[PDB]
Point group: C7
Chain length 236, copies 7
Amino acid sequence: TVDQQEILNRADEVEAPMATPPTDVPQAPSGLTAANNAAEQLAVSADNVRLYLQAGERERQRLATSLRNAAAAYGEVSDFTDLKTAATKLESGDQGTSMVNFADGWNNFNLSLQRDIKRFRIFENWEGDAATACEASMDQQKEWILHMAKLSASLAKQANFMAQLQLWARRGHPTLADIVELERLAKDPDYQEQAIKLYAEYQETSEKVLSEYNTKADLEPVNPPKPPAAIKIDPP
Amino acid sequence: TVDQQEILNRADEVEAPMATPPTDVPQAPSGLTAANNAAEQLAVSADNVRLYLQAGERERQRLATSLRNAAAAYGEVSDFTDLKTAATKLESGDQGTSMVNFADGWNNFNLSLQRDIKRFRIFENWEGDAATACEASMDQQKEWILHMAKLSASLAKQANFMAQLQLWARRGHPTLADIVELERLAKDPDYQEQAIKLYAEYQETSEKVLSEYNTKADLEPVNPPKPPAAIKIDPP
Amino acid sequence: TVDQQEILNRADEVEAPMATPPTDVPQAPSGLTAANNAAEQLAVSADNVRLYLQAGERERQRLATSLRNAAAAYGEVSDFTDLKTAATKLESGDQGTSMVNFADGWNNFNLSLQRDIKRFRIFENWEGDAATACEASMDQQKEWILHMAKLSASLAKQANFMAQLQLWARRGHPTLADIVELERLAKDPDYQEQAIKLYAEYQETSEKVLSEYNTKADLEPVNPPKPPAAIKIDPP
Amino acid sequence: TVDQQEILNRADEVEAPMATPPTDVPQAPSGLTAANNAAEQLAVSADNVRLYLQAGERERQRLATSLRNAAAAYGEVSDFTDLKTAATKLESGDQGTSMVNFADGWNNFNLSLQRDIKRFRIFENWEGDAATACEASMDQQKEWILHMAKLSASLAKQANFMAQLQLWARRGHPTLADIVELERLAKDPDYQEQAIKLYAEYQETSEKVLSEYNTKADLEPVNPPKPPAAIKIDPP
Amino acid sequence: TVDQQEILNRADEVEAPMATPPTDVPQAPSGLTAANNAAEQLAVSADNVRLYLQAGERERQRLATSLRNAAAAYGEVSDFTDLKTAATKLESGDQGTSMVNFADGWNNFNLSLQRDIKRFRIFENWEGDAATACEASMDQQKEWILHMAKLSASLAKQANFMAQLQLWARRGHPTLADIVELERLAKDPDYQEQAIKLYAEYQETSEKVLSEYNTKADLEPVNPPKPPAAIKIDPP
Amino acid sequence: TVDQQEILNRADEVEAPMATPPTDVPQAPSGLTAANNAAEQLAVSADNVRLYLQAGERERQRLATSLRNAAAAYGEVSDFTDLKTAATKLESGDQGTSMVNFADGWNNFNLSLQRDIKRFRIFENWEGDAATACEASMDQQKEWILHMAKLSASLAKQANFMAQLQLWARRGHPTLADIVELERLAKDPDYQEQAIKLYAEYQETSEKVLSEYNTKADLEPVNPPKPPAAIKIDPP
Amino acid sequence: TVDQQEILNRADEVEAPMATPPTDVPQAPSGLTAANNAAEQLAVSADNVRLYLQAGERERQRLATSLRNAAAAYGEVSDFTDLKTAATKLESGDQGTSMVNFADGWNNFNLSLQRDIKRFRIFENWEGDAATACEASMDQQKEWILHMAKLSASLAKQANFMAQLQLWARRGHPTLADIVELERLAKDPDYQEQAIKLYAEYQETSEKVLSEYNTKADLEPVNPPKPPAAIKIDPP
């Protein structure tokens, strides 16, 4: 006939908790202002993704309620200070370890969302109009979940990008020790022919690296779409 | 039953003031005419963004009013003068510090708008047609707010671009001191073989740098979309 | 109740004169035929923009009339002659100063149009169907004004482009003095081995520069869209 | 009241003759077959543009008639022979002067069409449904005229392109005199080591230049859109 | 009144024969298999274009009949054998002369179709609904004719492409005489150090040239659209 | 009157057999696994094309039946083993001859389909609604046939691509004989300085060639569209 | 008449089991974290594809049921530890053999799905509305199956990509043995001039290779579309 028990089991399965998203807060990789902006952009994007996940959770409760109603349809139930400032900022911070932890957490969440779309599979023994409509609704929830996983992945991708940017800038930029060297070796009045040249070259490379850093550390915000409305089935 | 108190609390939350946008006026980085044009373009774009923010504020008041009405639905409640002119203009101004302050303010505003979309989350305990319609309206307001944050970001991005352009032009262009040097060292009649060559090279590089400056300092205007109309719910 | 005085004040504000567009006529930067074509294209585009501005002015009068009617709804109220020709033309004219004056005027007009969209802001105290419709109409006028400002900007951009093209061609092309030199130094029969070589090189570079000049001096016409029709509100 | 005289004056203004298009027939720049094809393509495109201009003239008469009817609505009123052939063809013809005359004429026509859209401006003192409809019709005619001017411009652009192609090919291709030289200097049996090399190089460059010439001289046809139908207003 | 004679004259003009398309059959430029494929592709495309031209001819007869009916509405009326094979094929055939004759014929047809759209011009003295509809139908026929001319042009363009490909391959590929030379000079046992090197280089260049030849000689088919249906006007 | 005999003749012509597609099975050019995959992909694509050709044959029978009914409407009728493995596989197989036979067959089929669209030409003496509808149906069949010919061409193109890939890989990859040489010349303990270098270079080039081979030998599947449904005309 | 037996045979043919998809689980090619992520992404994508294949199987059962009903319609029926860590991870794992086994299995599945669309061919002897509708439904199932085969192919393609990435990284990155060498040869205090240079170069190349590895090992998820609903035919 009609297997109400299959429908009830599927209703409990569809609103079971999914994976818990990460909650760690990523810190700025360095002391540069663009780095702090990037870290704050990531934190805000993470908060917004968590918020929309709670919205999806509500949609799944409503879908489970509709399934239970559908089941009940059957039966009863030259000074160096600019260079020194740039270098000091660049070598401060944690150099990206918290970014990597952030990215790992969000990649894990990506994968664990992807593993959890079994709960939206089609029914074995249920058929008819209500079953078709509920399957369409579960399919929509599945699509939204996959989109959310993709957003989680893009979040982790941006965090990894920030970590690699920090490394690239750190090996492309004159060290604080090199700047202290160049300054002192400019305190002696025999090398000027060389030190002044080196100062100009450092100051060049520094402006160049920092311009690269400032533009590439401008992260896109992540806005999650709201989950599609669950199908509503009133109690009999 | 129906939690009117949740709706009233959400109505007060949705029309609470958001972050205040920055009001500082960015100055031209140099004395060049294109720089002044760019600064004025930025000032006008900032004014226009502030104006549309006031429009969005009105839409949020109307949305709060509609929520209060919906709640009441339940119960009672060769001369060097061209070179000298070019250099003098290029080294005048504040060299972009007010642009950087402008950009910082607008990036902060970007982030603080992004942090303030909690006020548009779905309802916990409210359901039905009015709740669905009000959620759709809040979702629209949220979308508009995110677009406005994106425009704020683009504003700050343009200001940062102007600051970097000023630096690039300043290290790519012969100094006023170098021009005074070249002129004087051309006042002595032994070096002509060299000074005339150097004059032509300077004048080349100067035209080149200034053409770059004039085209890249042509900033796009920013026109904000008007906020979507709030849903209207009449009093019972 | 309903503030008729706000509506009447807004009606007077919306049809107040806007900035006056520039009327100066840009001259050809040189004697080349493509330069004259470019100057005439600019003059025609400027005339067409001014014409459409008058159209927009009429639309704003009609909008003000509709607002006054809406207010009344409440209560009572080898020879060198080709080279010598090319050079002589290239060094004639004003070399682009009138183009720069033209561009400055049109950039100023761009900015002053952008500053004048306050007159289309939403109403504070007016609400209902007529207010919504009038706000939509003002929004349309605002959009058209911003498009017109963008066209003004593109006009100034083209004029600046012509000035820079004139400079580029002038420093890329052999001078009239250099051609007179090469000719005379070819009047003596000892240098032929050199002068004939130099003549061919000049004639090369000249064809090259003039082909560049002729294609890049082909300016797009500017056709302004007509302003959207104002909303019509009949007197009561 | 209603100014019939304004409408009648505008009716006479809208059907006044516009500029006369050029009628000169462009000749092939050289003797090459692709050049003759290009000249014939240009002649056909010019004929087709002139034909559609006559169509637009009829539409303007009909529009003027409709305006007069609308006014009456108010009151009473190794051998060298392949090289020698290629060179002989390339140096024949007029080398592009008639192309330049053609292009000048069509650029003048472009500009003079652009200057003649005043006749489609909105009305000062006429209003209502018929006025709106007639303004829409005049706007359509204006759009068609601007498109026709753009086509005229593209026609002149192609003619200029053909002239520049002729120059480019002429300075990129071995002269007839150089070929006669190479042949004769190959009649003496001491230089073969050199002349045979030079023959192969000429024959290379010649095939190369002629392939370039043949593909770039393949001109797009110009098909004018027919003018939009004038609005029809019957006599009262 | 109504000029029936104009309509009848236009009916005879519209169904007069147009230019006759060429009927010559293009031969393969060489003995290569890709060349034979290309020639057959061209022959088939030419046949298909001729077929659709006959279809258009029928549409013009029907249009003329409809015009006559509309008129009657008023009143009564290392071995070298792979190299030797490649070279022998490449130097066989007519080397592209029949391709050039084919292309000339089809370019002439292109132009003569373009010259023959006068027969679709608007009417001078005929007006009303039938005239508008017949003008729309003639306009459609004109559009189809222009598309057919464009297809004829593309046909000639492909034939010219094949001829140029044959030339390019012939001067890029080792001659049969050079291969006989290399073989014989490899029959003597003193040069091996050189001949074996040269054999490998030839065999390289030969594979390279033939791969180029085989891919570029893959011609697109030409499918003509069928002509739009003529408007049908029944006899009175 | 109405020529039924023309319709009956066209009905017999439209369902006459078309060309028979090739049935030969293409073998893998080498022993590489990607080559076997490519050959199997080609075999499957060929089978699928043959299947859809049978579908089109049924559609043509139905169209002929509809034509006969329409006619009846009138009257009565370092070890070297990875290198040795790679080389041994690369030099096995038939090196692409069966691919070339396959491609020839499918190109012939392409052309012979293109030659066989006469059977869908418009009618001479048949007119009216049924004739128009049957012509539209024949036009659709013609379009499908041209698409099928294009798919046949793409099939042959892929086979040719595989043959050229086999040649490219074979001359870009160290021979089995060269690998046996390098190994043995590494069996003697005097050359190591050289042989080890050569081994690394071979192993490099081999990985490089095989990666190229594996990615380019990944062939797209060919899915034919089903033929459009024939028009149905019931018997009178 | 109507061949019910053909329909019943086709119903049994359409729901016969298709090929069984592979079930092997691909392991990470190395010890890098991105490699583990890639392997897990592949495993999840494989699981999701298998799930949708089960969905398609249900659709084919329903289609077979509808066919049986349609049949019944007729009758009764400087330390080195970062380098040492990087190298140790890179050389761990199986270096991609399980990826290659995975890819082979999924390519086989691709091909075997492509070979199994005979079951959706059109009917020989069945005609009418039900036959047309069932053919459309089978065509849809065929389209879905081809899309699923394409997804299987993309799955195998990604696995092959991971294997090639592992090889590329392994020959682009300093060996663990080379790092042990460089460290020890830095334990002796005579070579520093060289070893320190080599350490910096290794550390460079290592960061470079690992950044490449981490970004290219970021695999797209594969989301299969759900199969189109089978046509429903109720029993008579």
